[PDB]
Design a protein around this ligand. Structure first.
Ligand SMILES: Nc1nc2c(ncn2[C@@H]2O[C@H](COP(=O)(O)OP(=O)(O)OP(=O)(O)O)[C@@H](O)[C@H]2O)c(=O)[nH]1
Lengths: 82, 593, 403
RNA sequence: CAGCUUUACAGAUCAAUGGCGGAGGGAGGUCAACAUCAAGAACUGUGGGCGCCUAUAGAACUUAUAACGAACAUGGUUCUUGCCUUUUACCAGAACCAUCCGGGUGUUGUCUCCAUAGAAACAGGUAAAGCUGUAUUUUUU
RNA sequence: GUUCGCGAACUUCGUGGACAUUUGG
């Protein structure tokens, strides 16, 4: 199975950042993730590609349309890789 | 390379220069020496005098290398003085412990069979030879008829296939292989089937019921608790009270008759099981265990791995799929082995003295008291007490240099390591012992009294008060004499066995008689009465054996299994040797300080 | 301030996972299962906890040679003289550990090892109060006793998620010497009993709730775990859940790659018996009985785990234990099962209400925490406290109530 | 059926760099002499060898606990039973030292079986051993 | 093993006690 998927799963709880194909960055507590990166997030801000930002509650995103996910730097340490 | 060489040199010449290891000489030479000594009949050299100091140790060593019923002749290594004196055994005896147990079990079985068979079992008469005369023997023994069939039961090829080729042998065997370290014989390893076989063989002897719960209130901790509460268990032992029995309750506001309700009887049994609750003021009382219950099945049938006596319930290949059929041919008994007590649950171990390997212990810890006679029960209790006290006060040693090895090394005048028949060695010791006694006597006031060759000292004639005063001598000397006599008796039985007009079964039986009757056959108790404790212990052991032995219709004089008694004797000897040695030293250093 | 902390850290066993990570995780809820390991007297829950501890740590201080070999347990949470001398775990002397799952989602778990013995329900009760999940543990053999039923009843009341641990399979393989079929039947019966004891939830090896264990030897598995280790090799990924489902219950599997028809033809032994229990039995036999080389070969082939040179020269019980540890790995399966069990947090609110009346919480403006039990962990007194809401920092000036 | 390392090699040039060490044995024996002994070894010190191993020595704390030894005998002082009185010699219980009988660990030597190079690899080829591997909504048709 | 007592067919089985020793001549 995919180690990036595993990492994503681990990041559950933590405040992940998240850009899509559209280029609309989010940042929030990662509620749930699946094998396909079907992310849910809480307390989430939402930047438009142009500039403006909008607060929102419980966003769902489908991994297909996700581009890249930033996880907190604590997860670097352990305990997924070995 | 040069540097390395230099280093090596430094390592070498700084401390401990090469003392040459002396060769193993012929027994013929030893015999010749002995003969010469005999011819000589006193010399009173200094070296000779010095060597005499270590006779009780020698005796002890000899005793330790007793040939077991399964062994024809214990061929044994020996140190011996240039004169032909103090000719004592070198090697320590030792054994693969489960193997040893198996052997013992086999012997027991054989004995039982013999009992079943023979009607008029002729017991051995003691003392075996004419004490008035000096019937010793060497040459005769050497060129005697074939040492007749010793005690080993006949094994079938089906069941005990893996052992029968090696089981009954000197060392014992499995001595030259991958299954041991080597001839030094310190670490033993095993495969399964052989181990299983050994276990099976044992069962007759060591059926210790190892449901840890069986020993509820018969664990050493429990016994300790009992001791330090002045409390008992019908089957368990009893002691002096360990603290002063000073009650004086004075029926207070608390603990009155009309305050408390005497509903439970509050027996002794409870007080140790819950030391801190039922007993008030538990000084130095260890916390006992509290374990879970056992579900098990142990059987002797053809079929395996089935519900026998349980209650019945209500209603790509998987990864091993005909690699196997779920039961291999050994796994029937593998499981049993796994379940077992110490020796066998392990397939490797360290070897132990055979004066270790207590085969009694497990019987006299096993809470028997139902349908036995009272004497037996008493004996068991005594045994427990003996054990328990020992457990309570252990002992710690440290760095030391052993005497035999020292003599081998530094001493001239010694020749060393002549492989003698053990019986021959014993005989020599007996002779030498006798000589030593005579020498001692000579050194003291030269007496009217003379030794029997079987050591029973007695006056020749001319009995007076002055004479008595002169020739009271020490208790130590008499103890020594007694010890010598004992050795002779055991040695003499072996001698008898070696010659005709005897049996191997009789040999073991004779040995048993000797050991389990010191009190009858020779009084040490007269001179050292702590030997009486030992004697008592031996008696108890004998008692335990006899009931255990004679469950079947057999009841009479024939029964070997001398092991525990022998062990006890060895222990006693060990306890006593040092004092004896000291005494001897004192005697020799009479003129000087 | 820091020096003291450093010193404290030093006087401690170095954990295999980094404790920093655990700490970080703890800063987030929902990554913290609080687990009460509970059961009857001598279930082997303490032993199980010991296994977990072993898995966690690199090398333990008072882990003797004998214990390492696998003779005596090393009940790592027995602690105080009383308990080691006595045999019984007596007080709630728990442990906290990070644990990866099947699919390695780490999660910092706050295990509390109950006492079994019935006169210490106090500690058990405390554990229940603390712990949002409870690993009930049961002796296979002793079965679901009345005690266990009572526990179950008084874990539904609390309330809590109930993973079960059918511990002591060795006892039915080696002590009872049940045939494999018989063993399976017994297990089924036990499961049924458990279900009966329960009101609402059904428990089974499928749906990750049963955890089959033998702590003496020291293996736990769930069925999913087993599949992961030893049946990904031989099946395509899509049909793994299905396979798992098939595994338990009145189901049979005939020579057909890959069906698996419920029932049936000629030689019986069900899916569970064929793909699990039977395998276990074989392992046991081989471990004890077989020529060692052949066993090794088998383990290279059928499990891809290598009996080392030093391990080969072991005695049986130890050797067997070693084998089983090699097979079923450092117990992730159990953790996974636990995770599956705990809803999570639908229950938690209810539990909190039960503890302290129904109502509504306040996260930021305050913190509150149940001081559960005073203890004597490091000689001196501590209060084992559970923080329900807020975050309680060191030195903080704090309100309290004896209840 | 693909790849990388690791040995046997052919014949290389030949660096090159790695690794191999620039070579020092492996066994055992009722062979010794010497230390050092519950295992621990935390934490510190001070070495080799890289927030960490390996040796050392220093206490801490461990439990010792059941088993340096699945073993158990014997002395002595003191206290207390009890023989009783006296000597041994003991009865039967404590406390603290000692005594044997055995034991491992490494250090070294010495004595009988098993061995056996003085270098090898680069570039790939041959042979074996070890790990990783099918398009219709979430990844690459 | 050695004595004394009691139960069953002097003799033997089932059994309850008691069984140091020398210096002080
Ligand atoms: N045969 C067998 N024995 C086991 C097994 N698990 C544990 N035991 C043994 O049975 C006892 C139970 O283990 P413990 O850890 O003492 O039980 P516990 O969890 O401490 O019980 P509490 O003290 O009441 O909590 C121990 O003596 C174990 O060695 C098993 O799976 N098979």
């Amino acid at each position: 199975n995919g180690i990036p998927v595993k990492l994503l799963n681990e990041a559950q709880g933590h405040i992940v950042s998240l850009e899509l194909t559209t280029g609309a960055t989010y940042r929030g507590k990662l509620v749930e993730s699946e094998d396909s990166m079907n992310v849910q997030l809480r307390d989430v801000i939402a930047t438009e590609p142009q500039g403006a930002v909008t607060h929102m509650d419980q966003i769902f995103v489908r991994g297909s349309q996700i581009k890249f996910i930033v996880v907190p730097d604590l997860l670097k340490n352990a305990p997924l890789f070995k | 390379k040069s540097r390395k060489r230099a280093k090596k040199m430094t390592k070498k010449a700084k401390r401990s220069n090469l003392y040459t290891p002396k060769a193993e000489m012929p027994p013929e030479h030893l015999r010749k020496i002995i003969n010469t000594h005999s011819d000589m009949a006193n010399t009173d050299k200094k070296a000779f005098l010095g060597a005499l100091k270590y006779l009780p140790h020698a005796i002890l060593k000899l005793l330790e290398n007793m040939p077991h019923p399964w062994e024809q002749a214990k061929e044994v290594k020996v140190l011996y003085h240039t004169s032909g004196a103090i000719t004592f055994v070198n090697e320590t005896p030792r054994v693969i412990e489960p193997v040893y147990t198996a052997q013992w079990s086999a012997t027991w079985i054989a004995m039982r069979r013999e009992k079943r068979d023979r009607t008029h079992f002729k017991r051995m008469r003691f003392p075996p030879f004419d004490d008035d005369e000096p019937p010793l023997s060497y040459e005769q023994h050497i060129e005697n008829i074939e040492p007749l069939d010793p005690i080993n039961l006949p094994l079938d090829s089906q069941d005990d296939e893996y052992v029968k080729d090696w089981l009954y042998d000197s060392r014992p065997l499995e001595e030259d292989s991958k299954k041991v370290n080597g001839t030094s014989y310190k670490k033993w390893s095993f495969d399964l089937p052989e181990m299983s076989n050994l276990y099976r063989l044992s069962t007759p002897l060591r059926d210790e019921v190892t449901d840890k719960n069986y020993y509820y209130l018969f664990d050493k901790k429990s016994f300790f608790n009992g001791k330090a509460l002045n409390n008992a268990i019908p089957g368990g032992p009893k002691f002096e009270p360990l603290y002063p029995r000073e009650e004086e309750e004075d029926y207070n506001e608390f603990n009155s008759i009309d305050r408390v309700i005497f509903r439970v009887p509050i027996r002794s049994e409870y007080k140790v099981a819950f030391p801190h609750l039922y007993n008030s003021r538990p000084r130095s009382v260890r916390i006992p265990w509290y374990n879970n219950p056992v579900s098990c099945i142990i059987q002797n049938d053809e079929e395996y791995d089935t519900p026998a006596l349980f209650f019945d319930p209500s209603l790509f290949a998987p990864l091993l799929a005909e690699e196997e059929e779920l039961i291999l041919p050994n796994t029937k008994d593998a499981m049993s082995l796994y379940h077992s007590p110490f020796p066998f649950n392990r397939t490797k171990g360290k070897m132990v003295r055979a004066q270790d390997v207590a085969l009694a212990k497990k019987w006299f810890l096993q809470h028997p008291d139902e349908e036995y006679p009272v004497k037996v029960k008493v004996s068991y209790q005594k045994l427990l007490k003996n054990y328990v006290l020992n457990e309570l006060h252990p002992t710690l040693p440290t760095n030391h240099n052993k005497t035999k090895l020292l003599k081998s090394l530094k001493n001239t005048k010694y020749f060393q390591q002549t492989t003698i028949d053990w019986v021959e060695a014993g005989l020599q010791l007996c002779r030498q012992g006798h000589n030593m006694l005579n020498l001692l006597i000579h050194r003291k006031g030269l007496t009217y009294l003379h030794l029997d060759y079987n050591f029973n000292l007695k006056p020749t004639k001319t009995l007076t008060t002055k004479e008595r005063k002169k020739s009271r001598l020490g208790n130590s000397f008499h103890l020594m004499r007694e010890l010598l006599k004992m050795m002779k008796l055991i040695v003499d039985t072996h001698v008898q066995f070696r010659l005709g007009n005897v049996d191997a079964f009789q040999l073991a039986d004779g040995i048993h008689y000797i050991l389990n009757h010191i009190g009858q056959l020779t009084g040490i108790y007269r001179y050292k009465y702590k030997v009486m404790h030992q004697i008592r212990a031996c008696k108890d052991l004998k008692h335990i054996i006899y009931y255990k032995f004679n469950k079947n219709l057999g009841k009479g004089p024939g029964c070997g299994f001398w092991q525990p008694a022998w062990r006890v004797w060895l222990n006693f000897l060990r306890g006593t040797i040092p004092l004896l040695e000291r005494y001897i030293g004192n005697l020799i250093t009479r003129q000087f300080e | 301030e820091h020096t003291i902390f450093t010193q404290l850290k030093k006087n401690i066993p170095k954990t295999r996972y980094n404790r920093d990570y655990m700490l970080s995780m703890a800063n987030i809820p929902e990554r913290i299962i609080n687990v009460g390991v509970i059961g009857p007297l001598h279930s082997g829950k303490t032993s199980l906890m010991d296994l977990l501890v072993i898995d966690s740590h690199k090398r333990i201080p008072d882990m003797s040679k004998n214990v390492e070999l696998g003779w005596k347990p090393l009940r790592y949470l027995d602690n105080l003289k009383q308990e080691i001398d006595r045999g019984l775990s007596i007080k709630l002397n728990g442990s906290t550990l990070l644990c990866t799952d099947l699919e390695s989602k780490s999660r910092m778990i706050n295990f509390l090892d109950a006492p079994g013995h019935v006169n210490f329900m106090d500690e058990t009760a405390v554990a229940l109060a603390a712990s949002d999940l409870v690993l009930i543990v049961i002796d296979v053999v002793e079965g679901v006793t009345f005690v266990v039923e009572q526990l179950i009843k008084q874990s539904i009341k609390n309330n809590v998620a109930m993973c079960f641990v059918i511990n002591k399979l060795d006892r039915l393989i080696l002590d009872l010497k049940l045939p494999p079929m018989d063993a399976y039947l017994k297990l089924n019966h036990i499961i049924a009993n458990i279900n009966s004891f329960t009101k609402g939830n059904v428990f089974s090896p499928i749906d990750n709730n049963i955890i089959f264990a033998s702590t003496k030897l020291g293996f736990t598995f769930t069925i999913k775990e087993f599949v992961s280790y030893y049946y990904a090799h031989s099946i395509p990924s899509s049909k793994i859940d299905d396979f798992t489902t098939r595994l338990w219950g009145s189901v049979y599997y005939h020579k057909g790659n890959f069906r698996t028809k419920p029932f049936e033809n000629v030689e019986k032994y069900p899916t569970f018996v064929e793909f699990i229990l039977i395998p276990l039995y074989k392992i046991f036999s081989y471990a004890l009985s077989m020529e060692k080389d052949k066993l090794k070969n088998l383990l290279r082939s059928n499990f891809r785990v290598n009996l080392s040179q030093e391990a080969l020269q072991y005695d049986p019980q130890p050797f067997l234990k070693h084998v089983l540890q090699l097979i079923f790995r450092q117990q992730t399966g159990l953790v996974d099962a636990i995770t599956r069990c705990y809803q999570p947090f639908e229950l938690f609110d209810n539990k909190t209400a039960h503890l302290s009346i129904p109502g509504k919480s306040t996260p930021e403006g305050t913190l509150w925490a149940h001081v559960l039990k005073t203890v004597d962990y490091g000689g001196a007194e501590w209060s084992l406290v559970r923080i329900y809401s807020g975050l309680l920092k060191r030195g903080d000036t704090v309100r309290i109530l004896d209840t």
